[PDB]
């Protein structure tokens with residue numbers, strides 16, 4: 504294991520001040536330009552729009568264009584220019600640091616897995632929510648596909664078992680994963696019709712492809728809002744905050760390009776322009792950066808270190824999502 508922040512120190516401890524509870528929704532395939540807040544022609548985030556204190560960041564570039572490339576980069580200390588996907592597994596990452604310093608680290612995954620991020624930590628700290636042995640919310644649709652909102656159930660059991668510790672909870676969304684966008688959301692989110700239902704995209708009508716994708720965003724809107732609502736039930740004992748960032752974007756037909764994962768060298772902008780949201784309880788004193796700060800996946804690591812009052816030399820000068 505190649506270390507990167509052995510000098511990390513936590514300025515204050517949860518037995519000397521209020522313990523901190525953060526949820527980090529790791530998004531999937533959401534495009535910045537299909538977010539109402541960024542100027543999209545459709546109200547794709549009605550529920551988030553109603554919550555005090557959500558900052559929308561209009562200029563975020565992902566590190567890569569695929570789940571395997573981007574997710575380790577989001578948690579890496581190296582930044583996008585030095586980051587090596589092929590050695591990421593055995594670098595210290597920001598969660599390794601936070602767990603070393605005693606932050607209780609949980610990763611629930613309704614997508615695939617942590618793509619190497621959690622491999623150094625005990626397996627009990629990772630849970631698979633794609634299956635019904637963990638996810639109680641699977642029979643809400645004719646595919647029995649387990650829903651992201653199932654990762655919220657029982658989080659109060661985790662909080663009880665870590666009572667009075669700092670806690671970072673990662674929720675890795677199914678989100679807008681394709682090509683079967685039509686499967687990603689329940690009926691109550693089927694707001695735009697008709698929708699595409701085939702695996703051969705391009706063969707679909709373009710408006711119907713857009714509709715299915717947009718419907719899936721509506722379910723992600725509901726998921727992020729319920730995440731914040733779950734956090735708000737602990738706001739008095741805990742300093743609660745919520746960070747959402749998508750791992751990459753998605754091509755939706757432009758110039759004949761669909762899905763994602765094109766190499767950075769010639770990948771279109773739709774594949775790297777990702778939404779990011781930050782909410783915090785005003786009681787925590789955290790100040791977000793300007794809504795239009797120029798931001799990339801490099802800001803995630805320093806954001807998480809700052810949310811837990813930890814400083815590290817390697818990201819000392821790095822812009823974060825918070826001041």
Ligand SMILES: [Au+]
Nearest residue numbers: 532569570750
């Ligand atoms: Au992805």
